[PDB]
Amino acid sequence: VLRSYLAKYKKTLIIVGLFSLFINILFLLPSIYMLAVYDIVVPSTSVPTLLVITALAVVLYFALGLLQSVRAKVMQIISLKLDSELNKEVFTSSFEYAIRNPSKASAQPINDLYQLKQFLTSPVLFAIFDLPWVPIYFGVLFVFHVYYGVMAILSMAVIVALAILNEYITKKKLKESNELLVRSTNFLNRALLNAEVVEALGMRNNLYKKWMNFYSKHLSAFEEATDRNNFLSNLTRIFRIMAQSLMLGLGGYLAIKHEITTGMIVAGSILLGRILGPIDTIVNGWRQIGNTKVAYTRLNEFLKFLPEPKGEIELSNVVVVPPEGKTPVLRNINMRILPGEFVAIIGPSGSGKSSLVRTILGIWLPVHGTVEIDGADLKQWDRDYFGKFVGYLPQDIELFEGTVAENIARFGELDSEKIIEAAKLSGAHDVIIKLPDGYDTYIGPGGITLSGGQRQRIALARALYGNPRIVILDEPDSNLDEQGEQALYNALIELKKRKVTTIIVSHRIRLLNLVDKIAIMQDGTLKAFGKADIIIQKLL
Amino acid sequence: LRSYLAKYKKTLIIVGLFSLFINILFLLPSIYMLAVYDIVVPSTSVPTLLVITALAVVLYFALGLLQSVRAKVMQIISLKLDSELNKEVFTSSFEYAIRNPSKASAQPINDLYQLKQFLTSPVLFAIFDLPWVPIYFGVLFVFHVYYGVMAILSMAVIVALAILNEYITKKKLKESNELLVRSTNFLNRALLNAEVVEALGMRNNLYKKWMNFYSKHLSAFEEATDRNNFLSNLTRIFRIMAQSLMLGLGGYLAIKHEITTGMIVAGSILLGRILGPIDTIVNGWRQIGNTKVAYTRLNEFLKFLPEPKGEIELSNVVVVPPEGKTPVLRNINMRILPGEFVAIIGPSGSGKSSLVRTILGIWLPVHGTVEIDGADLKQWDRDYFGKFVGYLPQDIELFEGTVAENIARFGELDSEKIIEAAKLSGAHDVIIKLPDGYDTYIGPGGITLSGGQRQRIALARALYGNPRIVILDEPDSNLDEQGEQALYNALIELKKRKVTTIIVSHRIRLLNLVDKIAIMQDGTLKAFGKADIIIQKLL
Numbered sequence A: 001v002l003r004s005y006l007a008k009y010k011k012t013l014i015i016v017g018l019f020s021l022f023i024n025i026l027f028l029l030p031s032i033y034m035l036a037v038y039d040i041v042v043p044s045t046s047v048p049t050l051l052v053i054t055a056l057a058v059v060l061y062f063a064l065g066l067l068q069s070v071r072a073k074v075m076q077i078i079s080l081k082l083d084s085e086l087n088k089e090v091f092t093s094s095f096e097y098a099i100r101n102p103s104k105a106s107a108q109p110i111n112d113l114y115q116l117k118q119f120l121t122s123p124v125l126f127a128i129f130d131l132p133w134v135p136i137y138f139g140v141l142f143v144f145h146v147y148y149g150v151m152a153i154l155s156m157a158v159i160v161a162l163a164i165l166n167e168y169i170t171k172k173k174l175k176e177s178n179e180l181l182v183r184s185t186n187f188l189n190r191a192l193l194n195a196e197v198v199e200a201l202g203m204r205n206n207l208y209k210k211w212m213n214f215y216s217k218h219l220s221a222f223e224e225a226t227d228r229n230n231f232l233s234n235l236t237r238i239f240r241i242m243a244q245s246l247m248l249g250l251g252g253y254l255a256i257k258h259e260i261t262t263g264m265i266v267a268g269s270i271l272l273g274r275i276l277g278p279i280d281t282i283v284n285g286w287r288q289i290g291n292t293k294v295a296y297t298r299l300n301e302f303l304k305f306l307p308e309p310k311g312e313i314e315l316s317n318v319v320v321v322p323p324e325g326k327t328p329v330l331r332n333i334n335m336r337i338l339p340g341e342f343v344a345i346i347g348p349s350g351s352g353k354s355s356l357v358r359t360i361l362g363i364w365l366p367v368h369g370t371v372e373i374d375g376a377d378l379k380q381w382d383r384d385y386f387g388k389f390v391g392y393l394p395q396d397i398e399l400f401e402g403t404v405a406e407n408i409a410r411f412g413e414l415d416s417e418k419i420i421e422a423a424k425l426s427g428a429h430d431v432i433i434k435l436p437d438g439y440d441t442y443i444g445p446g447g448i449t450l451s452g453g454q455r456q457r458i459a460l461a462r463a464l465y466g467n468p469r470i471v472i473l474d475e476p477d478s479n480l481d482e483q484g485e486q487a488l489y490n491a492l493i494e495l496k497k498r499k500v501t502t503i504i505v506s507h508r509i510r511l512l513n514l515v516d517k518i519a520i521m522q523d524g525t526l527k528a529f530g531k532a533d534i535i536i537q538k539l540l
Numbered sequence B: 001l002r003s004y005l006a007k008y009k010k011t012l013i014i015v016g017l018f019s020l021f022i023n024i025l026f027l028l029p030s031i032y033m034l035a036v037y038d039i040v041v042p043s044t045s046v047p048t049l050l051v052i053t054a055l056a057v058v059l060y061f062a063l064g065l066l067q068s069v070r071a072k073v074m075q076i077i078s079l080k081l082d083s084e085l086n087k088e089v090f091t092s093s094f095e096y097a098i099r100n101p102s103k104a105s106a107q108p109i110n111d112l113y114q115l116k117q118f119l120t121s122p123v124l125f126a127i128f129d130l131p132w133v134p135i136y137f138g139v140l141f142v143f144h145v146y147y148g149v150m151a152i153l154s155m156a157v158i159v160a161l162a163i164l165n166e167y168i169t170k171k172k173l174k175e176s177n178e179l180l181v182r183s184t185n186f187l188n189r190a191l192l193n194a195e196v197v198e199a200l201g202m203r204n205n206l207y208k209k210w211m212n213f214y215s216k217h218l219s220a221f222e223e224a225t226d227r228n229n230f231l232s233n234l235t236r237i238f239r240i241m242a243q244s245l246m247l248g249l250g251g252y253l254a255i256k257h258e259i260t261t262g263m264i265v266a267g268s269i270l271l272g273r274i275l276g277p278i279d280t281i282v283n284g285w286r287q288i289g290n291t292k293v294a295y296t297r298l299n300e301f302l303k304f305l306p307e308p309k310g311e312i313e314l315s316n317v318v319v320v321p322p323e324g325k326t327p328v329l330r331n332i333n334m335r336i337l338p339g340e341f342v343a344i345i346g347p348s349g350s351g352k353s354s355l356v357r358t359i360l361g362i363w364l365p366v367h368g369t370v371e372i373d374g375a376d377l378k379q380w381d382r383d384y385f386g387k388f389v390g391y392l393p394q395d396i397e398l399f400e401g402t403v404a405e406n407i408a409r410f411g412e413l414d415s416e417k418i419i420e421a422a423k424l425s426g427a428h429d430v431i432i433k434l435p436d437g438y439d440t441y442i443g444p445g446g447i448t449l450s451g452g453q454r455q456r457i458a459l460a461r462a463l464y465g466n467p468r469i470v471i472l473d474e475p476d477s478n479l480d481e482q483g484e485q486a487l488y489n490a491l492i493e494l495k496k497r498k499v500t501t502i503i504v505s506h507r508i509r510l511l512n513l514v515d516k517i518a519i520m521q522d523g524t525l526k527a528f529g530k531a532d533i534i535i536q537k538l539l
């Protein structure tokens, strides 16, 4: 719905439409200064009247240019009010969207938003705004004589024809050529993440074959598109010259007879170059209209996605299907984790324990049943506020581009106090010291500039930042060393004495004692969930 | 460097000869205009009127052709340029992204797209007409002296406005573009971690951090277009006004005794062609601007361009990671004999993965040598070398595609070979339970798989091809009891196959199989000796 309405809010298009008209009227001046002169050459009044009409011409041209220059700065502001309102919604909606549709997710909505702003500022757009006021030119050429604009009609029927033809032989190629370019871009982006192994196992040429299934199909569309577009963009620019010259052909064949003023011989041809003018410039730069309309529809779809916790968690009749999953990954999960309770989630890798984690948090939505936090049904909590009360350390850690302090603070306001205790609790503090420029050390995208073991320590501090009521650690011991594990162990102990409801996905036995309740998963179903001492019995 | 590939082509002289003829053929619109006034003086009969018209039409049908061939050629020039640079950009991006992880993106492919667009665009044809503007200049002044002055004193005005347009946008187009890419890159990188973002609700927080790039892009995109358009507007109106002021002098010179009768218009027409190209240039200097950015960036991006028995040896090796000033490996000295196992243990951050990444030749040292069997400072072509090595990185780097493909390193799908590799790694047990097991669609990186499953497959890829050297960088992170048991069996079989295996792990079981052990600390190889010795001294 809002897809069109966000651009529809700007009603200045009439204010520019009304305005475009006034521009188009002054465009007659070069043609007025054509007839006005030959109505001065014959009467031979060179010294005075020409120069007034010259002054008239120059002055009106400054007025012409003035009424034409300010049109541009309006579309620019239109592009900003367009940008500012869409800018935030694009960046926020993308994160929520890239979880429901992880297959298709990139910064393309920005580049397309960028592509639109370019269209509004582009010269081709104004060439469209000049067209709805062409019937004025169609008239002034006809009021002088009927044999003239017959060419104007019959040339328009030929020029408009070529412009229409340019679409239907490139509409099917460009829309394809633009898209497959994005697929090739994304494929390379995803692959470049794994550049390390690609170089290790030298499988760059092997991936090149795989990459060619998208790129070779892009070129085949780009070649035909530009070729056919160039073929006809040339026919429209040259027909502007021939048709103008043919006006002299009939502007002489009918001017040797005094039906036409001796000066109107030329003025008639000029007006044709302007009736057929915008269409020429349109087809010449039709790719802008192409890619900005392709970029339009692309940014279009993307925008269609638009108390205090105490510790009780509950799952009732829960079935979860992962985004783009087809098959259910969690089947009939029934569990109630009381406040301040510890929970170890053990089991094999096919179990779906990270899925139970992701659905308890609310990352994944259950297709059946409900997830209740503090009895209250989840999805009623605000995503932005609910985050300050929960802690999360995923399996893939997921640190961000920024400094250590920023990361731990979830890129909130850097509270030198809050950050220290978070690092003191997680034990991350003793690692963050060693960094060149501790706490202020720059971490590359994802955390590439840091050891995975170090990353997880810092990733823990972030989880325990601001003393959350719920803590979900998903295999926080992967990549950790002896010290890092001792740190995690201490954090759990202190956390248990603070009475923080915690869930740890871990099979490390040293921490299994302080668990109270173990949950066993198997084949996407909750096989067992009871007191830890009771589960450990059943496990021997 | 990039230009030497453009300089390869000498067809630009054919562009020269053709563009030359175009400038001659562009005289007809005004010459035909003259031919009209020469019908009038004699009132030469009207069948002759349709004759010169017939001449004009047939001449224009040739004008369009010699001008559309340029479009047919420049179009072809862009393709043979692509096919020469296409693979080079793709294959180097992986090398580049390891040396330049900060600027690691698919951008260099996008810059290629921008150039191919520039060769096809109408704006480029305007540039090819400039060096023969003196032609129109000629007919204009040779006709009348006072006309030639206008053409000089006019050209100097648009050229002025055109040069103003340069150094008031040359500074912002570079920035407006550069930061939009870094805003793109930042988002993509940050969008990989959407899982936490949604969990901890820090999207608005990232937005504040992200605006340090986009707001600077907007302030650059805004000012660049505002300044550019204002100047482009002083060029479009000036062409219309300069053409009108030509008739201003065109009329004065008809009442004075001069042969200006009828060419009064032909001057304005020819002038419109002298000021024709530049008008179309400034109207779209954005393209020329962004292509110059795309040109240099892709040019800069392109500036970077027996069988092993299983003996590895490092000597005086000093390694500094990409984009770090400090060394991460300091004077590492060790030799791994063929078929010898090696455990790399040490505190987290001591530089184990670093020692791994340099043995494999991913990172290059600033000092010292990495020799494989013979003195071989990465003289191997990695495309051939990759067949002989197996690698399981800490981050378990799978790709979008089938398990089969991933295990085969996207080589030809050998129905047999994949399974033997899997049966070795123990992945075969796991791969089957997936629906249409061996031909499942693994999402990009393995999002559609449990990380615990991903590491099993990654081991199958490692082992596949019966590699001489096998490096496993912490292959037990996220492994089932069964999966850990599988890796244990895999290592046993590899030791019977006398493979030279380097396992980075501190697990109890593996240290017993591993023959020799290496202890790391502060990027210095603290120790390297027989396992039975070290293990006992770890008490």
Ligand SMILES: Nc1ncnc2c1ncn2[C@@H]1O[C@H](COP(=O)(O)OP(=O)(O)O)[C@@H](O)[C@H]1O
Residues within 6 Å of the ligand: A102, A322, A323, A324, A325, A329, A348, A349, A350, A351, A352, A353, A354, A355, A356, B447, B448, B449, B450, B451, B452
């Ligand atoms: N992003 C995803 N999309 C679809 N299915 C998924 C996704 N991630 C995991 N799965 C499915 O869930 C299973 C793994 O569940 P997971 O929660 O990862 O268990 P664990 O925590 O033990 O690794 C796999 O069999 C896979 O089919």
Ligand SMILES: Nc1ncnc2c1ncn2[C@@H]1O[C@H](COP(=O)(O)OP(=O)(O)O)[C@@H](O)[C@H]1O
Residues within 6 Å of the ligand: A448, A449, A450, A451, A452, A453, A454, B321, B322, B323, B324, B328, B347, B348, B349, B350, B351, B352, B353, B354, B355
């Ligand atoms: N990609 C990188 N860029 C720059 N420095 C790095 C990078 N990776 C690791 N380091 C540096 O090396 C140290 C850890 O080395 P690493 O190879 O991760 O050893 P380990 O794998 O045993 O942690 C860290 O202190 C960090 O400063």
Ligand SMILES: [Mg+2]
Residues within 6 Å of the ligand: A353, A354, A395, B450, B451, B452
């Ligand atoms: Mg998991």
Ligand SMILES: [Mg+2]
Residues within 6 Å of the ligand: A451, A452, B352, B353, B394, B474
């Ligand atoms: Mg490591």
